Design a protein around this ligand. Structure first.
Ligand code: NAG
Ligand code: NAG
Ligand code: NAG
Ligand code: NAG
Lengths: 311, 82, 224
């Protein structure tokens, strides 16, 4: 399991710091560029999430389709291929994954991702159809068809086992594969802690940023309409400046930690993009890079904000 | 501030909010300007801003069978920058 | 060799005129650093709630005891501006460091070697790469082999001959519709199926798809 993106959150620092108050706004102008520099940072985080998603999933030019007749030499891919009967054209195991993983008025917002889950399911189905029908060939150039058992015999030569060891055992090998897929499907019906932690960390940060609006920072009140209702302007200003400085420090803290989270999500997305080229579009000789044991092949499945590889 | 672009002429609700001044079309193209939630916009058209659901690529069905193979008969040397 | 050399020489021409036509990755690190400095300088003219943003116009105007609280606001806002700039430079430097580590390993594995890692050294099968210098960066020209002009053939896992199953040593068995050949897999080059480009394992019963073609033996024709 690898995380690929995080939620494209955005904050208007003027509404966050000041709400409707023009008095607060004219004081906030004395701090210069800070609220512009913060918006620049969050929008930089946001466009990177679409870039992360594109670099993992958009590795195919063609949208490859499976043939209608599933004659794959006894290997059964039904649990990983898309169900045509569902509202989303999504895999049985992808539906199972999408079931496991679980303010705006303050100037907080969430922007939608550029690719929908339908589009990410389309790309992963195209990568599946490419590998199942054409081996690694669609990664290097045009997809060249090859019979699936003959493709698996090349993959045995790739690990230093002769082709006849596959063909003499093809029934057993297909049964061990079909059984192992069924075991994954049972195991997932039991976790996606790698993905759920990214959701929890971001929710914890927004929850804290909202909670800080209730702090008074040594002012008479944390409600700036109450301050501005009780005091005349020269005394209201020194109270509002205490809220402005406390709320700026709260945003500055939040944006700094979002920049640091985005950097490790970017590293995880670069790893996932590399892992799709080397483990899905090819056979890897790198030890433990594509799971434990000698790598034969692997299949991508989409997950909310992430990717799952079946090695 | 600017009463044009309040108009009902070309209006389109999207999951990215409300888009005004762009013509929604039933076709699909590669993403030119990203709007969000699968929607993109472009000038491609006597010419206008269109809005569309993006295409992901050309659809292709591989000629798979239990006894068919495709073999290359030539090659291209290609050079590419990074 | 002539055809391969012409395809290479031609492809270098396409790079040369494409660069004569972008370097957006190198330009946008220059733009980000310029914008951050321009912002840091522009913060100096802001008041941070003091009576002015110019120290001499505090000091020449006020008594020292009241100047201290005006100065202290400028100290605070400037210090916070500086501290913000340095934090964003530390974060951006970590991203450039990751890019330089990628470029360094990419030079070892793509220039000083040949890589079997799919898509690490450009698209298609990696032949070799060449470095070129660029301002604050590097350019790799990756040279790759891309297969072209496919043909369909029928194929089989094995040949059955003399009741023995024969498998290809390197290639695949293919048929043009009437005859069977063995070919290398990445480039069509059909050859007669023989004892010397195949090997045997077991009888013909176990293999799922298997076909009854002859296998030739080059040591059979000799008479002594
Ligand atoms: C291979 O490609 C080159 C370039 O298109 C062409 O000149 C040559 O005749 C081709 N050879 C074959 C066997 O198709
Ligand atoms: C191979 O045969 C199928 C079925 O006739 C055809 O659709 C496909 O285009 C052929 N491919 C090539 C490379 O000739
Ligand atoms: C198959 O190849 C052999 C090569 O000698 C040739 O005699 C025969 O005519 C070919 N058949 C077809 C259908 O091209
Ligand atoms: C292959 O050859 C053997 C021996 O002549 C014969 O028993 C068998 O039926 C043949 N099979 C096919 C598919 O021609």
């Amino acid at each position: 399991i690898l995380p690929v993106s995080m939620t494209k959150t955005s904050v208007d620092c003027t509404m966050y710091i000041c709400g409707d108050s023009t008095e607060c706004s004219n004081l906030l102008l004395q701090y210069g560029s800070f609220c512009t520099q913060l918006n620049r940072a969050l929008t930089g985080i946001a466009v990177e999430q679409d870039k992360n998603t594109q670099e993992v999933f958009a590795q195919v030019k063609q949208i490859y389709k499976t043939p209608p007749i599933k004659d794959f030499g006894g290997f059964n891919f039904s649990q990983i291929l898309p169900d045509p009967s569902k509202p989303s054209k999504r895999s049985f195991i992808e539906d199972l994954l999408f079931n496991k993983v679980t303010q705006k008025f303050n100037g907080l917002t969430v922007l939608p991702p550029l690719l929908t889950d339908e589009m990410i399911a389309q790309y992963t189905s195209a990568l599946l159809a490419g590998t199942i029908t054409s081996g690694w060939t669609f990664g290097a150039g045009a997809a060249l068809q090859i019979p699936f058992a003959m493709q698996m015999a090349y993959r045995f030569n790739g690990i230093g086992v002769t082709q006849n060891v596959l063909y003499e055992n093809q029934k057993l090998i297909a049964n061990q594969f079909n059984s192992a897929i069924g075991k994954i499907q049972d195991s997932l019906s039991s976790a996606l802690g790698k993905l759920q932690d990214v959701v929890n960390q971001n929710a914890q940060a927004l929850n804290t940023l909202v909670k800080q609006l209730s702090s008074n920072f040594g002012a008479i009140s944390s409600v700036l309409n109450d301050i501005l209702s009780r005091l005349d302007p020269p005394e209201a200003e020194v109270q509002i400046d205490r809220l402005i400085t406390g709320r700026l420090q709260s945003l500055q803290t939040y944006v700094t930690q979002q920049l640091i989270r985005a950097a490790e999500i970017r590293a995880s997305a670069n790893l996932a993009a590399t892992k799709m080229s080397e483990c899905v579009l090819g056979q890897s000789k790198r030890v433990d890079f594509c799971g434990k044991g000698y790598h034969l092949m692997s299949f991508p499945q989409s997950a909310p904000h992430g990717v799952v590889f079946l090695h | 501030t600017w009463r044009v672009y309040s108009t009902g002429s070309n209006v389109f609700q999207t999951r990215a909010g409300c888009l005004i001044g762009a013509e929604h079309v039933n076709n699909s193209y590669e993403c030119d300007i990203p709007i969000g939630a699968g929607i993109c916009a472009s000038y491609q058209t006597s010419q206008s801003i269109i809005a569309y659901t993006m295409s992901l690529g050309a659809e292709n069905s591989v000629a798979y069978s239990n006894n068919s193979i495709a073999i290359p008969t030539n090659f291209t040397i290609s050079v590419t920058t990074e | 060799q002539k055809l391969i050399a012409n395809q290479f020489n031609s492809a270098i021409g396409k790079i040369q005129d494409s660069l004569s036509s972008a370097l957006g990755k190198l330009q946008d690190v220059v733009n980000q650093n310029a914008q951050a400095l321009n912002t840091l300088v522009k913060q100096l003219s802001s008041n941070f709630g003091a009576i002015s943003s110019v120290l001499n116009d505090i000091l020449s105007r006020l008594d020292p005891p009241e100047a201290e609280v005006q100065i202290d606001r400028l100290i605070t806002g400037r210090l916070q501006s500086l501290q913000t700039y340095v934090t964003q430079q530390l974060i951006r430097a970590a991203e450039i460091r990751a890019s330089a580590n990628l470029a360094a390993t990419k030079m070892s594995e793509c220039v000083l070697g040949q890589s079997k890692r799919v898509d690490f050294c450009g698209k298609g099968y990696h032949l070799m790469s060449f470095p070129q210098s660029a301002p604050h960066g590097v350019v790799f020209l990756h040279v790759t082999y891309v297969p072209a002009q496919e043909k369909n053939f029928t194929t089989a896992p094995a040949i059955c001959h003399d009741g023995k199953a024969h498998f290809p040593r390197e290639g695949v068995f293919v048929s043009n519709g009437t005859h069977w050949f063995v070919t290398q897999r990445n480039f069509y080059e059909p050859q007669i199926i023989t004892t010397d480009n195949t090997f045997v394992s077991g009888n013909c019963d176990v293999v799922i798809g298997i076909v009854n073609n002859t296998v030739y033996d080059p040591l059979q024709p000799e008479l002594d």
